[PDB]
Design a protein around this nucleic acid. Structure first.
Ligand SMILES: Nc1ncnc2c1ncn2[C@@H]1O[C@H](COP(=O)(O)OP(=O)(O)OP(O)(O)=S)[C@@H](O)[C@H]1O
Ligand SMILES: Nc1ncnc2c1ncn2[C@@H]1O[C@H](COP(=O)(O)OP(=O)(O)OP(O)(O)=S)[C@@H](O)[C@H]1O
Ligand SMILES: [Mg+2]
Ligand SMILES: [Mg+2]
Lengths: 254, 320, 626
DNA sequence: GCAGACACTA
DNA sequence: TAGTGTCTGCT
DNA sequence: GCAGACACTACGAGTACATA
DNA sequence: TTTATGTACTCGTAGTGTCTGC
């Protein structure tokens, strides 16, 4: 059935190492479009969305849509056994109890064929829905990650204010402050180091420390991330994938 | 070095639920569960050697022989059981997706579960509550009082009783025809008397008789293994004359190489389990026997202490 | 007419078969012992014909079966109310003489229609799930075109809604009223509660015996109101660190699935459901104090489910939450539910058997369903013949509490000739070993507060008390030997006998007062504290005093009272300097002054003397020292 | 054992 | 709103 | 090459049990 | 709760080593 030949293993390893920290049991859905995975953590506060297109696979082949719900601890343990130049290849049989993933080396001697048992995760339908967001600001993912880490040096107090049409991060905490004012991220020299805000009357929002701390751990996939804010809708931090997309839904604390 | 033949205990272990003898009602219930397949969580308890874990293994084998290797997790006291090494493994096994026949479920056999930590049982409570649709549990312990109350609530209690002489005799004759060994009825009754309901003890004693003498008679059986010391202690405590008890003690325990502490503990157990005499007499005997036990434990272990204990037993029995 | 037949029976003023369900609508109370059937066996035959067997004698009681000897309260109650009395000889002819259905008596007719109503409601709900089963099967067939009957009975027959629960209706409604009015208390800043008083309590608590439905009730109340259930348990760690890193951020955050599940007004909130609070087996590394901090500060409804509340481990939960107590439900609701289950499962059990099944299992409904599922595999007829074997095979050996252990141990029946055969010595040893850490203390506390019934001929009560005290002292010696450097823990059964079984077997009978908790723990703590203070003041006055701590209390301390309190009494504040001069001489502080006064007993108690001293006189003494 | 509260019935 | 039947904590 | 970044073993503190 | 060793368990922390990266 499923024969999803990746070109190599680094991107998949980065994806798993990114979203493995928050959720513990993801449910992959196999479709001709690609790989769809929606995961909710144990606190029911953060949601993880995976969309990987058929372009991101070398030779992808799916006959029937099969549900492959696997653990992330065991998947990480298996994927720590893989090199970088090897070609990861996900294989699933008919009505698969276990998913077979194998690495092919360019040395042409080494075939490491690990079979991973599949868990029985409850069948949850696609709860995703198109929503309009009040604030939509984007910056390079490394810059956002380091700024969020500086904000999270303090306990839980994060504040974003858009007064005077300029973005300031005046954060507080239990002892000390994290009021790191960021300059307007505009640079014609580097197109990736750019900023873009959709105003729609923004005021402020406060998140949790571990929430964005786990959001920023997936920074390896995309150069820049579009941070989205909505008043009555779950938040969105969508990373850009060459063949799909990766967004982390979140509910802002009240 | 020469290899060893398989012991008769494990060579003739039953593989189906029809070969196991003893509690007919419990085995019939197990066979009806076998036919239906919807096996509930069960706790199996009894004194050692009456067919507890072999019945669980036979039930699992007949339920899913093709998947015994895949969907049966046999954790036990030899394996490391704790809070995390149990919760992680059992949760992974219970959430594991394995395709059974419609009436079959994965079986988690917790053999020797009376030694488990209470927090492990607390986690097991929610494990069984959540994943009862896919996996089923099967405890097997000697003492069922160690298992916490909620687990016994969320389980089907199956109590095993010690086998009567008829069932042990039937199994002994079956194994004798299978092994083709000569025997005498007196030797077989001696083996049954020595076993005291334990089938494994009966098999061990029969094999020892066969391999040491060849003919299963009373003389050979009593040569290899002695009469149980609880019985000799019971008849020592119940004797009429003090001289009779003194000589029984000396000859049958002191000259047979029995430790004084063992004799005192056996006397305590017999007097606790003794029935013909009055309750207050047993309480007084236990009090003075415990005084003697304290004397033995402090270091004074001699024949004189046991003789004095017997003298006090008789001074209590003759009513001053 | 049952009443007409009962009048024809010759009463007393000091066994054959019968028609099925012939004692219907008849109340039976058993007192004394019967020559043919013992109390348990006669009660089985009393319930064999649908007769309610109450445990207490009443004015509305119809007939009482009289034996030989029982509690004096029953003997005085029967005589004054002139209740009908029939001996065991009349019981045998009662079975044959009474026709089926209990006749047309007023009590019998009322019992039958209630029993028919119980069967009627059983049949009404029997096809409710059957119609539902046909509904889901048709829906499942359509989905397949465009697993059941292999499930645990405790799961498929789970309460669909709050109306399907059995018992604890008041507790369930209390929880529902607390949950539905949590937002109202949130608006009022948890200051003033309502008539029930649940408004001030931010979080509710559920505690009760296993199998009665705490988890199901909490989940159903959460689901009905539309809340999102956030549940934790013992399967995952709940120590301080991951509690701070887990649900701590969920106190004021909503469901990400809550937005995507939507009219619902409570669909985007959390109801924290911590089942098995007893699994936090940690005094410091455990999360019990952390959960207390959540009870202090939480912006969302929170619910706890445990089994026993009174453990010292769970002490910080004393006055924290709306304590909702569940209990063993009465046999009628379980009777109706089991009738529904039996109708739906095509196996039949007699309706009177359900009472014995509940009595055997001690009000554990889930274990009752497990018993039914296990028995129904091969034994399809649960009736009068199999009930005894089923009960003695599935009896639940629940460990007893210390008070129940003391009450059971000081009974004169179990040390009688007939009583001890049923309750052997090993049973008493196990009864001790249930709570061996507390049992000797509970025996010693109230072994002389009971009226003995096992007195030997010519032996007074005081002699039995003396023998019991001697054996308690011997058991104390054995206990000291056990808990010492040698650690002779193989000697435990001897201590069991000497400290609980022998002392009780001499003074057993009926308690004159009530089962009292041991006073040795509190007095021991007080003595340890007083020893600590004695050491502190002794080493404060160590210089210049050639006397140890024992001689300080016996000799020195009575003299200090008449140098440090009598000037306050005979001349008041005029001797403020002299008292301070003596107090400063022995390096005594102000704290030591109050400590010395509490060491006195009898006629030298200074608590009243200091109280009578005017506050103006005492105020100056403190200020001058400072 | 001594209350003490929760029900069913009156 | 008031009699029983029965489960439950007393430290 | 050097400084983190990680997962790993090891040590220490605390709780609980000790006859069927 | 006291109880006085020894065992077993659980957790938390501190070092200890190795792998990524620049
Ligand atoms: N009822 C029985 N029928 C046949 N063989 C039996 C029976 N009971 C015990 N045996 C034999 O006893 C041996 C081992 O018995 P087990 O069932 O392993 O003992 P057990 O019941 O597990 O007791 P413990 O508590 O585990 S020591 C095997 O050789 C079995 O064949
Ligand atoms: N009041 C009740 N009425 C009907 N069925 C019940 C009732 N209480 C329990 N049950 C049955 O028992 C099953 C499990 O009950 P639970 O609510 O899990 O017991 P519990 O109160 O949680 O006790 P624990 O948590 O095991 S100590 C349910 O699915 C029902 O089948
Ligand atoms: Mg075994
Ligand atoms: Mg529960």
């Amino acid at each position: 059935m499923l024969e999803a030949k990746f070109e190599e293993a680094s991107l998949f390893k980065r994806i798993i190492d990114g979203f493995k920290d928050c959720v513990q049991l993801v449910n992959f859905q196999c479709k001709e479009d690609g790989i769809i995975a929606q995961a909710v953590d144990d606190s029911r506060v953060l949601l993880v969305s995976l969309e990987i297109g058929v372009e991101a696979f070398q030779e992808y082949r799916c006959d029937h849509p099969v549900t492959l719900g696997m653990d992330l601890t065991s998947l990480s343990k298996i994927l720590r056994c893989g090199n970088n130049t090897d070609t990861l290849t996900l294989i699933a049989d008919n009505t698969p109890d276990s998913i077979i993933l194998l690495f092919e080396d360019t040395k042409k001697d080494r075939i490491a064929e690990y079979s991973l048992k599949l868990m029985d995760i409850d069948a949850d339908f696609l709860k995703i829905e198109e929503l309009q967001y009040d604030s939509t600001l984007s910056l390079p993912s490394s810059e956002f990650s380091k700024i969020v880490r500086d904000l999270s040096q303090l306990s839980d107090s994060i504040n974003i204010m858009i007064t005077k049409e300029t973005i300031k991060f005046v954060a507080d905490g239990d002892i000390g402050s994290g009021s790191v004012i960021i300059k307007p991220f505009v640079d014609m020299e580097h197109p990736e180091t750019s900023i873009k805000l959709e105003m729609d009357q923004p005021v402020d929002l406060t998140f949790g420390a571990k929430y964005l701390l786990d959001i920023i751990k997936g920074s390896s996939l995309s150069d820049r991330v579009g941070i989205r804010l909505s008043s009555e809708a779950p938040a969105l931090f969508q990373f850009d994938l060459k063949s799909g997309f990766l967004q982390f839904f979140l509910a802002p604390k009240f | 070095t020469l290899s060893l033949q398989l012991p008769w205990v494990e060579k003739y272990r039953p593989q189906v639920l029809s070969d196991i003898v003893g509690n007919k009602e419990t085995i019939d219930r197990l066979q009806q569960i076998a036919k239906d397949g919807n096996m509930p969580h069960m706790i199996i308890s009894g004194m050692p050697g009456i067919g507890k874990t072999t019945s669980v293994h036979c039930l699992a084998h007949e339920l899913l022989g093709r998947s015994y290797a895949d969907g049966v997790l046999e954790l036990n006291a030899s394996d490391d059981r704790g809070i995390d090494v149990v919760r992680n493994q059992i949760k992974h096994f219970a959430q594991k997706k394995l395709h059974l026949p419609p009436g079959k479920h994965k079986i988690v056999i917790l053999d020797e579960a009376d030694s488990m930590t209470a927090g492990a049982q607390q986690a097991l409570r929610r494990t069984m509550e959540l994943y009862s649709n896919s996996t089923r549990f099967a405890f097997a312990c000697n003492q069922s009082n160690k298992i916490i109350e909620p687990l016994q609530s969320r389980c089907a209690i199956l109590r095993y009783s010690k086998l009567s002489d008829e069932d042990v005799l039937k199994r002994l004759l079956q194994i004798i025809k299978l092994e083709d060994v000569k025997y005498t009825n007196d030797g077989l009754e001696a083996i049954i008397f020595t076993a005291e309901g334990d089938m494994r003890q009966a098999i061990n004693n029969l094999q020892s008789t066969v391999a040491g003498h060849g003919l299963v008679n009373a003389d050979n059986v009593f040569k290899i293994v002695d009469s149980p010391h609880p019985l000799i202690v019971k008849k020592m405590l119940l004797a009429s004359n003090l001289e009779d008890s003194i000589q029984i003690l000396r000859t049958d325990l002191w000259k047979k190489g029995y430790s004084s502490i063992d004799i005192v503990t056996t006397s305590f157990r017999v007097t606790k389990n003794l029935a013909q005499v009055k309750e207050s007499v047993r309480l007084e005997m236990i009090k003075e026997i415990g005084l003697t036990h304290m004397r033995i434990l402090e270091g004074v272990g001699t024949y004189l202490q046991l003789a004095s204990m017997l003298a006090k037993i008789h001074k209590l029995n003759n009513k001053a | 007419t049952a009443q007409d037949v009962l009048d024809k029976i010759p009463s007393l003023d000091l066994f054959p078969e019968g028609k099925p369900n012939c004692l219907l609508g008849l109340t039976i109370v058993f007192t004394g012992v019967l020559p043919t059937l013992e109390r348990g066996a006669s009660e089985a035959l009393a319930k064999r014909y649908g007769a309610r067997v109450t445990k207490s004698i009443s004015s509305k009681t119809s007939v009482v079966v009289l034996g030989d000897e029982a509690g004096p309260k029953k003997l005085e109650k029967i005589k004054q109310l002139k209740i009908k009395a029939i001996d065991e000889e009349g019981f045998k002819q009662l079975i044959a003489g009474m026709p089926a259905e209990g006749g047309d008596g007023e009590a019998a007719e009322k019992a039958r229609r209630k029993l028919e109503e119980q069967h009627n409601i059983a049949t009404k709900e029997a096809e409710l799930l059957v119609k539902k089963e046909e509904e889901r099967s048709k829906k499942l067939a359509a989905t397949r075109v465009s697993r059941e009957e292999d499930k645990l009975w405790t799961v498929k027959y789970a309460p669909t809604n709050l109306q399907q629960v059995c018992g604890n209706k008041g507790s369930v409604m209390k929880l529902k009223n607390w949950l539905a009015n949590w937002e109202n208390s949130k608006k009022n800043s948890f200051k003033h509660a309502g008539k029930d008083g649940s408004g001030v309590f931010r979080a509710a608590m559920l505690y009760g015996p296993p199998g009665i439905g705490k988890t199901t009730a909490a989940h159903l109340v959460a689901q009905e109101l539309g809340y999102d259930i956030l549940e934790q348990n013992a399967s995952d760690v709940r120590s301080k660190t991951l509690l701070n890193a887990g649900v701590k951020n969920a106190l004021d955050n909503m469901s990400v699935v809550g937005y995507f599940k939507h009219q619902n007004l409570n669909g985007k909130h959390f109801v924290i459901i911590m089942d098995e609070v007893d699994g936090m087996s940690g005094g410091d590394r455990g999360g019990v104090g952390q959960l207390a901090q959540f009870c202090r500060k939480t912006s969302t409804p929170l619910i706890l489910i445990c089994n026993e509340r009174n453990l010292p481990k769970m002490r910080p939960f004393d006055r924290v939450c709306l304590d909702i107590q569940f209990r063993r439900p009465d046999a009628n609701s379980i009777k109706s539910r089991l009738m529904t289950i039996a109708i739906r499962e095509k196996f039949k059990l007699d309706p009177n058997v359900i009472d014995r099944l509940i009595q055997t299992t001690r009000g554990d409904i889930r274990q009752v369903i497990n018993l039914l599922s296990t028995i129904s595999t091969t034994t399809k007829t649960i009736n009068h013949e199999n009930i005894n074997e089923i009960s003695k095979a599935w009896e639940k050996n629940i460990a007893l509490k210390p008070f129940d252990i003391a009450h059971k141990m000081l009974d004169g029946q179990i040390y009688s000739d007939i009583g001890s055969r049923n309750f052997t010595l090993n049973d008493k040893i196990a009864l001790y070993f249930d709570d061996f850490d507390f049992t000797p203390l509970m025996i010693q506390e109230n072994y002389l507060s009971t009226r003995p019934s096992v007195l030997k001929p010519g032996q007074s009560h005081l002699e039995a008390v003396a023998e019991a005290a001697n054996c308690i002292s011997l058991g104390d010696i054995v206990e000291k030997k056990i808990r010492s450097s040698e650690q002779l823990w193989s000697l435990l059964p001897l201590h069991a006998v000497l400290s609980s079984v022998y002392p009780a077997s001499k003074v057993a009978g009926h308690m004159a007062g009530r089962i009292n908790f041991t006073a040795w723990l509190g007095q021991n703590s007080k003595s340890a504290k007083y020893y600590r203070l004695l050491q502190e003041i002794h080493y404060h006055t160590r210089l210049g005093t050639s006397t140890d701590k024992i001689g300080l209390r016996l000799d020195y301390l009575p003299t200090f009272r008449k140098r440090l309190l009598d000037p306050f009494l005979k001349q008041g504040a005029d001797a403020i300097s002299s008292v301070i001069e003596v107090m400063d001489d022995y390096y005594l502080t102000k704290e030591d002054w109050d400590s010395i006064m509490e060491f006195f007993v009898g006629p030298d108690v200074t608590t009243a003397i200091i109280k009578k001293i005017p506050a103006t006189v005492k105020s100056g003494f403190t200020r001058k020292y400072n």
